[PDB]
Amino acid sequence: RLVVFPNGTRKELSADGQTVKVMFFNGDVKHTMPDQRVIYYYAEAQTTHITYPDGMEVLQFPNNQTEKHFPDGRKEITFPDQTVKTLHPDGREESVLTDGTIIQLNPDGSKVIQFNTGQREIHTADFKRREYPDGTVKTVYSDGRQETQYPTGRVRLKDPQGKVIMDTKA
Protein backbone atom coordinates (compact mmCIF):
# COMPACT_ATOMS: atom_id res chain seq x y z
CA ARG A 1 0.00 0.00 0.00
CA LEU A 2 0.73 3.70 -0.49
CA VAL A 3 -1.49 6.18 1.41
CA VAL A 4 -0.89 9.91 0.94
CA PHE A 5 -2.69 11.94 3.58
CA PRO A 6 -4.20 15.31 2.76
CA ASN A 7 -1.20 17.08 4.43
CA GLY A 8 1.26 15.25 2.16
CA THR A 9 2.45 12.68 4.69
CA ARG A 10 3.02 9.33 2.95
CA LYS A 11 2.67 5.85 4.46
CA GLU A 12 4.16 3.15 2.24
CA LEU A 13 4.86 -0.51 2.86
CA SER A 14 8.28 -1.70 1.67
CA ALA A 15 8.16 -3.93 -1.43
CA ASP A 16 8.90 -7.06 0.69
CA GLY A 17 6.04 -6.24 3.12
CA GLN A 18 8.21 -6.05 6.23
CA THR A 19 8.74 -2.32 6.89
CA VAL A 20 6.02 0.33 7.33
CA LYS A 21 7.58 3.55 6.21
CA VAL A 22 6.07 6.90 7.10
CA MET A 23 7.39 10.02 5.38
CA PHE A 24 5.94 12.97 7.28
CA PHE A 25 5.31 16.28 5.54
CA ASN A 26 7.88 18.02 7.80
CA GLY A 27 10.77 15.79 6.65
CA ASP A 28 10.54 13.31 9.54
CA VAL A 29 10.68 9.62 8.72
CA LYS A 30 9.41 6.66 10.70
CA HIS A 31 10.07 2.98 10.03
CA THR A 32 8.19 0.35 12.00
CA MET A 33 9.60 -3.18 11.96
CA PRO A 34 8.01 -6.64 12.36
CA ASP A 35 9.26 -6.91 15.96
CA GLN A 36 7.42 -3.56 16.62
CA ARG A 37 10.75 -1.65 16.89
CA VAL A 38 10.16 1.94 15.77
CA ILE A 39 12.95 4.00 14.16
CA TYR A 40 12.19 7.74 13.96
CA TYR A 41 14.36 10.30 12.17
CA TYR A 42 13.78 13.93 13.23
CA ALA A 43 14.74 16.10 10.26
CA GLU A 44 15.47 19.46 11.93
CA ALA A 45 17.48 17.94 14.81
CA GLN A 46 19.02 15.32 12.45
CA THR A 47 18.52 12.82 15.29
CA THR A 48 17.56 9.13 15.16
CA HIS A 49 15.31 7.81 17.88
CA ILE A 50 14.76 4.06 18.29
CA THR A 51 11.96 2.77 20.50
CA TYR A 52 12.04 -0.86 21.43
CA PRO A 53 8.85 -2.79 22.59
CA ASP A 54 10.27 -3.30 26.11
CA GLY A 55 10.31 0.53 26.46
CA MET A 56 14.03 1.08 25.95
CA GLU A 57 14.84 4.13 23.85
CA VAL A 58 18.06 4.95 22.08
CA LEU A 59 18.85 8.31 20.58
CA GLN A 60 21.68 9.00 18.16
CA PHE A 61 22.75 12.60 17.67
CA PRO A 62 24.49 14.19 14.67
CA ASN A 63 27.62 14.96 16.78
CA ASN A 64 27.87 11.13 17.10
CA GLN A 65 26.66 10.99 20.71
CA THR A 66 24.35 8.15 21.87
CA GLU A 67 21.80 8.32 24.69
CA LYS A 68 20.19 5.15 25.98
CA HIS A 69 17.14 5.23 28.31
CA PHE A 70 16.75 2.11 30.42
CA PRO A 71 13.54 0.73 31.90
CA ASP A 72 15.11 1.08 35.41
CA GLY A 73 15.31 4.89 34.87
CA ARG A 74 19.05 5.11 34.12
CA LYS A 75 20.22 7.11 31.15
CA GLU A 76 23.60 6.24 29.61
CA ILE A 77 25.34 8.80 27.38
CA THR A 78 28.25 7.91 25.13
CA PHE A 79 30.07 11.08 24.12
CA PRO A 80 31.91 11.49 20.80
CA ASP A 81 35.20 11.22 22.75
CA GLN A 82 34.08 7.73 24.00
CA THR A 83 33.44 8.78 27.63
CA VAL A 84 30.35 6.91 28.98
CA LYS A 85 28.25 8.87 31.53
CA THR A 86 25.45 7.16 33.45
CA LEU A 87 22.69 9.28 35.07
CA HIS A 88 20.99 7.40 37.90
CA PRO A 89 17.42 8.08 39.15
CA ASP A 90 18.80 9.21 42.55
CA GLY A 91 20.74 12.01 40.81
CA ARG A 92 24.27 10.51 40.82
CA GLU A 93 26.24 10.87 37.58
CA GLU A 94 29.09 8.47 36.93
CA SER A 95 31.49 8.95 34.04
CA VAL A 96 33.87 6.19 32.92
CA LEU A 97 36.77 7.66 30.98
CA THR A 98 38.39 5.57 28.26
CA ASP A 99 41.40 4.75 30.48
CA GLY A 100 38.87 3.38 33.05
CA THR A 101 38.96 6.26 35.58
CA ILE A 102 35.53 6.73 37.13
CA ILE A 103 34.29 10.20 38.09
CA GLN A 104 31.18 10.36 40.22
CA LEU A 105 29.15 13.54 40.84
CA ASN A 106 26.86 13.17 43.81
CA PRO A 107 23.66 15.00 44.82
CA ASP A 108 25.33 16.20 48.06
CA GLY A 109 27.89 18.33 46.22
CA SER A 110 30.74 15.80 46.33
CA LYS A 111 32.95 14.57 43.53
CA VAL A 112 34.53 11.12 43.79
CA ILE A 113 37.31 9.93 41.53
CA GLN A 114 38.16 6.18 41.41
CA PHE A 115 41.56 5.76 39.71
CA ASN A 116 42.78 2.55 37.97
CA THR A 117 45.36 2.15 40.70
CA GLY A 118 42.65 1.54 43.32
CA GLN A 119 43.13 4.97 44.92
CA ARG A 120 39.94 6.98 45.47
CA GLU A 121 39.70 10.77 45.87
CA ILE A 122 36.70 12.29 47.63
CA HIS A 123 36.21 16.07 47.25
CA THR A 124 33.67 17.95 49.37
CA ALA A 125 33.23 21.67 50.24
CA ASP A 126 35.07 20.93 53.50
CA PHE A 127 37.88 18.53 52.52
CA LYS A 128 39.80 16.62 49.88
CA ARG A 129 40.37 13.02 50.86
CA ARG A 130 42.44 10.26 49.42
CA GLU A 131 41.69 6.59 50.18
CA TYR A 132 44.16 3.77 49.52
CA PRO A 133 43.52 0.03 49.08
CA ASP A 134 45.27 -0.84 52.39
CA GLY A 135 42.80 1.32 54.34
CA THR A 136 44.98 4.41 54.72
CA VAL A 137 43.01 7.64 54.46
CA LYS A 138 44.60 11.13 54.05
CA THR A 139 42.29 14.08 54.46
CA VAL A 140 43.13 17.71 53.89
CA TYR A 141 40.62 20.20 55.30
CA SER A 142 39.81 23.63 53.77
CA ASP A 143 41.64 25.19 56.78
CA GLY A 144 44.84 23.30 55.92
CA ARG A 145 44.70 20.68 58.71
CA GLN A 146 45.71 17.21 57.56
CA GLU A 147 44.61 13.88 58.97
CA THR A 148 46.16 10.51 58.28
CA GLN A 149 44.18 7.38 59.27
CA TYR A 150 46.46 4.36 59.15
CA PRO A 151 45.31 0.77 58.42
CA THR A 152 46.08 0.01 62.10
CA GLY A 153 43.49 2.35 63.57
CA ARG A 154 46.04 5.10 64.32
CA VAL A 155 44.82 8.62 63.54
CA ARG A 156 47.31 11.48 63.27
CA LEU A 157 46.14 15.08 62.87
CA LYS A 158 48.40 17.97 61.90
CA ASP A 159 47.96 21.76 61.98
CA PRO A 160 48.38 23.68 58.71
CA GLN A 161 52.16 24.04 59.29
CA GLY A 162 52.56 20.31 59.65
CA LYS A 163 52.81 20.09 63.44
CA VAL A 164 51.11 17.07 65.03
CA ILE A 165 48.18 18.05 67.29
CA MET A 166 46.49 14.63 67.76
CA ASP A 167 47.99 11.12 67.54
CA THR A 168 45.81 8.36 68.87
CA LYS A 169 45.41 4.59 68.63
CA ALA A 170 43.20 2.11 70.52
Side-chain angles (χ1 to χ4, degrees):
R1 287 171 168 170
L2 174 66
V3 181
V4 185
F5 291 81
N7 63 7
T9 289
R10 318 171 62 78
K11 188 177 194 161
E12 184 181 69
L13 194 72
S14 60
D16 75 351
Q18 302 194 75
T19 313
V20 179
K21 302 183 301 100
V22 181
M23 291 187 152
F24 292 95
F25 70 84
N26 72 340
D28 295 353
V29 182
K30 184 172 66 182
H31 290 185
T32 307
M33 314 306 298
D35 55 13
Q36 310 148 49
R37 276 188 310 141
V38 174
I39 307 90
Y40 195 104
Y41 177 74
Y42 295 99
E44 205 53 49
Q46 304 174 62
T47 297
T48 296
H49 181 174
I50 306 89
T51 306
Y52 298 84
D54 81 340
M56 181 171 275
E57 303 186 17
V58 174
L59 285 94
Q60 300 181 277
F61 291 93
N63 56 19
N64 196 29
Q65 187 161 314
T66 308
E67 300 192 357
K68 172 165 47 167
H69 303 257
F70 287 86
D72 61 28
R74 290 179 303 124
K75 170 179 181 191
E76 180 196 281
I77 301 137
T78 305
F79 289 92
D81 70 7
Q82 311 292 280
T83 296
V84 176
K85 182 194 290 179
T86 302
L87 287 56
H88 294 271
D90 71 1
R92 286 180 283 138
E93 295 186 14
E94 284 175 20
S95 293
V96 182
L97 302 189
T98 174
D99 77 3
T101 307
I102 302 169
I103 304 162
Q104 174 191 69
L105 304 189
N106 293 309
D108 71 0
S110 60
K111 182 175 86 188
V112 179
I113 309 173
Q114 179 69 68
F115 301 93
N116 287 316
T117 71
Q119 287 173 42
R120 198 180 165 239
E121 248 209 304
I122 305 88
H123 293 247
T124 74
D126 292 326
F127 63 76
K128 184 206 304 193
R129 170 177 286 160
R130 193 152 198 120
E131 302 175 342
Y132 300 78
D134 72 357
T136 305
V137 185
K138 295 194 226 271
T139 306
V140 182
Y141 284 91
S142 300
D143 70 6
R145 287 174 153 188
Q146 199 271 334
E147 185 193 71
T148 297
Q149 301 182 34
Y150 296 84
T152 52
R154 184 175 172 216
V155 178
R156 184 180 71 176
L157 184 65
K158 303 175 164 176
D159 75 10
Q161 290 73 54
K163 197 178 210 300
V164 175
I165 55 164
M166 256 286 164
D167 189 352
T168 64
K169 185 172 191 296

